[PDB]
From a paper:
Members of the Hsp70 and Hsp40 (DnaJ-like) families function in specific pairs that form transient complexes with non-native regions of polypeptides to promote the folding, assembly and transport of proteins within the cell. All types of Hsp40 proteins contain a J-domain that can stimulate the ATPase activities of Hsp70. The human type II Hsp40 Hdj1 has been shown to function as a molecular chaperone to promote efficient protein folding. Hdj1 can bind to the non-native polypeptide and suppress the protein aggregation.
The crystal structure of the Hdj1 putative peptide-binding fragment was determined to 2.7Å resolution by the molecular replacement method using the Sis1 structure as the search model. The Hdj1 monomer structure contains domain I, II and the C-terminal dimerization motif. The two Hdj1 monomers are associated into a homo-dimer through the C-terminal dimerization motif. The Hdj1 homo-dimer forms a U-shaped architecture and a large cleft is formed between the two elongated monomers. When the domain II of Hdj11 is superimposed with that of the Sis1 structure, we found that the domain I of Hdj1 in the complex structure was kinked about 7.1° away from that in Sis1 structure. The domain re-arrangements within Hdj1 were achieved by the rotation of the linker region between domain I and domain II (residues 242 to 249). When we examined the peptide-binding site on the domain I of Hdj1 structure, several hydrophobic residues were identified to participate in forming the peptide-binding site. These residues include L168, M183, I185 and F237. In the Hdj1 structure, K181, K184 and K242 are well-positioned to interact with the EEVD motif from Hsp70. The peptide-binding site in the Hdj1 structure is not occupied by any amino acid residue, so the Hdj1 structure may represent the free Hsp40 state.
Numbering used by the authors:
A (entry chain A), B (entry chain A): 162 to 227, 231 to 335
Write the structure that this text describes.
Amino acid sequence: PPVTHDLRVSLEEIYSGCTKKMKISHKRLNPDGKSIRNEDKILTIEVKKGWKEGTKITFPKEGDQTIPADIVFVLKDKPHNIFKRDGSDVIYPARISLREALCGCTVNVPTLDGRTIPVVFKDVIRPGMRRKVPGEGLPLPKTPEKRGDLIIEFEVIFPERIPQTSRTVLE
Amino acid sequence: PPVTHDLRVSLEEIYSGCTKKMKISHKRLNPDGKSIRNEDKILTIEVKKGWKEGTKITFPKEGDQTIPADIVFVLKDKPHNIFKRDGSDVIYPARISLREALCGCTVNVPTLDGRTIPVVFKDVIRPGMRRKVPGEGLPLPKTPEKRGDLIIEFEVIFPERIPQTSRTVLE
């Protein structure tokens, strides 16, 4: 009769990999065969770079005291407030103005390392369009050596309203 | 040991409901206990208005000849070249130009009955935006009386390129 527990991991944590120690509380029958203990246990866990979230981590019979469940942790992606994980890829929503989308603009794409990258656009940018940024993603598990890509996904914000005059011009 | 068979139904067929007769071919042991027949069978099927596709239809032991499988048909939505079914709702993608999206336009929404409906738009239309059209959808099974809605989903087609001059103006 195992037990499941979610393991929250920041996107940067998955980028470089991290040590996460979890505090649990189980039961121990103690020198009686009647009384039960409270005692806890700090289970340490190594999260290897870019682990497809969802990967399971088991701790043998860490459960209670009659046989004790196998306490398992399921890796889960903490929603990040800048990127959307997509496997080894990390999507980056670019909120651009209609003017920018038409007359060209520059996008300072932020990196996991914590740096920025300038990417220029001359041609008309279509809503939905996306520019891939090679290797700016997450390291691939099988080959932590190489990393996935960063994907720019543009959102064109339109103006709220258009003056009676602007209409004329817009032809 | 049953047998499954997909049942292709046009969206209009699901709108009004239809009779669909399927031609199958089974086996019959014949007066021997050795020889086997070829003989077919035209299984008629009543498709009630707006049936959530996927609904199963069984034909008792229509299978072979030793016990014969139960030939079952799974309702499937024929992809329609104008609408996208969404339950009792039918989505309608409106390919509009950026000019139209900004200066207002008129959308002649086509109906399942085979008629058109004019819907006006004054305010700036945003890419992704959608206008619901009450009761223009598919009849609800539980209540064939009332129908679902027709949903307009706009797609703003941007111009391919913008002349060196247009840029200036666009401010």
